Design a protein around this ligand. Structure first.
Ligand SMILES: *Cc1c(COP(=O)(O)O)cnc(C)c1O
Ligand SMILES: *Cc1c(COP(=O)(O)O)cnc(C)c1O
Lengths: 445, 446
């Protein structure tokens, strides 16, 4: 089949039009290896999406593939017992590897992983409320928590990465807070921002939980936590089994040991092959030079993209960790147009602007993507001058602050609107009808 | 590592939930398995009658499934930058052809996420708030609370305990607010006509009827309860779907599935291709003539043998249900568990909740090995535990059967004052509530 034939069959039977077809490049991948993907007609592309961050080492990494296929073929996949030898070896490796990890439990998705983290924190502390910043998954309570404010029906207060807000919330009602769960954003904030968050939480005896489902292997080889941010729980997911479905919740012994009373479970949590894969992933990441080489390829790409944009006079900001750097542009139309055009030149750029190199990249792969980016940017600017300021200026502070709010719900201003939101939210929590709680297990009533 | 005591100690230190992972399970850990048989860390062999807690339908390391999934992983890849793939479309095409309610189908990793998707899609498609529920749907709080009769305003879920009188009165009183009805079929106490009547009541109120077949999908029949002729607007599948590999599916009416975009559902691993290749192979095996019927013959052989063993010892019992998911109901909730713990000594993993699960890989030798173990174990427990092992013959009491239904799956089967008060009280609670207080919904409805 070709692209058109497959999408018409897909529209009839499985595809969500925007999520699966129109929001994505007009190709469907047939096979992929290392940094390179091949579509249904044999066209080749360098992937800069990391399979939407699922992949960290590269496609069909042979050590991961060997580990998973050996488990599937020589032992089995999902057994009548929930414990397995690879589960215990993986748990031991992760507990040795991570300062916060005293025990670790597993699941299939990051959405379920962060749900487990919140469920365990509530079960361990017996407290109702959770303070949240960042995407944690597609459940309603997670999505609503990305917006600043309190939802009494879920017991979640979004605080928009705002440290003034977090401090005032903990002072006003910290005794009701089971946990603070934060997806680290490290373009607009530095590590000290999260160190201060963690310290604030400890001051109030409130578990601090890092949702590293995205950052776990791209902020560094041991995530933001490993760069020196203390935490009581860390959730991992994207990259953990290099594309195979696995997530992990690791943290303080008493929080993890709330598993029984919490009622968490799941048929496939015990699934063994992806645990063998993750063990292989850790071994690769801890091989001398491998992660450093990956970051060097990310820097080569970021530096090249920054200079192409600046050379076109396009106001831009390219920054963040080498394996998850953001390309911030003056408006939300220019990037998508450039990235759509670059698909014609053999690259899958990440259309949201966070580019994701993998460990399989070499200089040739990076330079192929840079050549495509230069030609695509040139074509878009020549064809659509209105799309792009080309005067050589810098991004306005207004654009940078607006982008933070739009992109991840970050409330970075100290203005009248933001402070009014803080006041409104604290008053709504403190003044609420305490007889009305979310449904919790175990009950807190 | 090497033996059971070593592994559980290492697990307690780093990963194990004490009850769920260790003390609530038999004292062995499986190292490898094939067909109907499992081998533990010390090389002891066991016939599995738990179906890997229902994850497995064909048997361990089934060759066609192994080949399909290994080929995808090794020769193509696992999770691509595109969410569409050739195996995804071929699997969806097969499922749409295979099932009457399937006009489109979308995938996820777990049945818990699958049923959450079904409710999310029904709400997004109808723009309505409330969901009526019966049965286990997963481990989220709204799912677990919905197993109890009653209404939780913070989740928008009303549990109705499989009760048709309750369902009809709820739809009459506030059905215009009901986005969907989601029911996990219980087919020991109820027949198919019970669920046909549910589905018919829902259709009269333009309320989507959704079968949660994460458990029943391949064990009530090769096409589940739905395929036995129970109309539905959505069916959720999961256990068995990829013969142990993690995959779930939500299939159903075009307009409900096409609410995906506005619903906000997503997930990194929904697109994962190897388990879809495995599911394609599972359907091919299940649809191979003779395979499912042989599985049902083995289930009947086991069920008949267990019934004869219990009756031969004078133990009142009820053995019934579909051949691939039959229940062994006893006069108390301790006897079965003690027998099954003892039978582990004799090389069988019985399902400790009493619902025994053969797989397509069973032969007469595997069944009869389980039966001999069950006979030895029953005789030993009868001899040692007269406190829980009555041998005077007879049948289970009606009170025991009614109590068991309520405790096992929240079924309100009694037509008494207490039950009808609960129905009226719950309906009054819904109808008279403060309508300004809604759960968090996406898309927003207030
Ligand atoms: C991707 C993501 C999740 C959700 O993980 P899924 O496997 O897609 O359900 C949760 N948190 C963060 C920070 C993520 O990036
Ligand atoms: C097991 C089960 C679920 C949940 O499936 P998981 O994959 O374990 O999350 C949902 N509904 C029913 C009827 C089930 O038996």
């Amino acid at each position: 089949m070709n692209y058109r034939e497959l999408i018409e069959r897909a529209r009839r039977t499985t595809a969500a039009e925007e999520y699966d077809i129109s929001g994505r490049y007009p190709s469907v991948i047939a096979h992929a290896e290392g940094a390179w993907m091949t579509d249904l007609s044999g066209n080749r592309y360098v992937d800069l999406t990391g399979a939407d961050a699922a992949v960290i080492l590269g496609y069909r990494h042979p050590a991961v593939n060997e580990a998973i296929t050996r488990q599937i073929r020589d032992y089995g996949t999902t057994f009548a017992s929930t414990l397995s030898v690879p589960r215990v070896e993986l748990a031991e490796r992760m507990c040795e590897r991570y300062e916060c990890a005293e025990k670790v439990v597993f699941h299939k998705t990051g959405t379920e992983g962060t749900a487990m983290a919140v469920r365990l924190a509530r079960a361990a502390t017996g407290r109702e409320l959770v303070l949240s910043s960042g995407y944690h998954g597609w459940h309603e309570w997670q999505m609503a928590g990305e917006e600043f404010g309190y939802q009494q029906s879920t017991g979640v207060v979004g605080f928009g990465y705002n440290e003034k807000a977090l401090a005032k919330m903990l002072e006003a009602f910290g005794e009701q807070v089971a946990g603070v769960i934060v997806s680290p954003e490290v373009l607009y904030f530095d590590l000290d921002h999260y160190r201060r968050m963690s310290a604030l939480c400890a001051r109030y005896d409130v578990p601090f939980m890092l949702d590293e489902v995205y950052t776990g292997f791209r902020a560094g080889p041991k995530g933001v936590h490993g760069l020196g941010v203390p935490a009581d729980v860390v959730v991992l997911g994207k990259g953990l089994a290099n594309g195979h479905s696995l997530a992990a919740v690791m943290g303080r012994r008493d929080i993890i040991d709330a598993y029984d009373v919490s009622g968490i479970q799941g048929t496939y949590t015990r699934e063994v092959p992806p645990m063998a894969a993750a063990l292989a992933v850790f071994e690769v990441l801890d091989t001398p030079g491998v992660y450093e080489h990956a970051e060097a390829m990310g820097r080569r790409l970021a530096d090249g993209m920054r200079e192409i944009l600046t050379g076109e006079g396009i106001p831009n900001w390219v920054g963040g960790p080498a394996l998850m750097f953001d390309v911030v542009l003056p408006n939300d139309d220019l990037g998508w147009e450039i990235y759509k055009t670059a698909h014609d030149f053999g690259v899958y750029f990440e259309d949201s602007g966070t580019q994701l190199v993998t460990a399989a990249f070499d200089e040739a792969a990076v330079d192929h993507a840079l050549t495509a980016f230069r030609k695509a940017t040139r074509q878009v600017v020549a064809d659509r001058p209105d799309i792009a300021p080309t005067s050589g200026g810098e991004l306005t502070e207004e654009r940078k602050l607006d982008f933070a709010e739009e992109a991840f719900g970050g409330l970075l201003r100290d203005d009248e609107r933001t402070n009014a939101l803080i006041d409104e939210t604290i008053e709504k929590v403190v003044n609420r009808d305490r007889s009305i709680k979310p449904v919790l297990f175990p009950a807190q009533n």
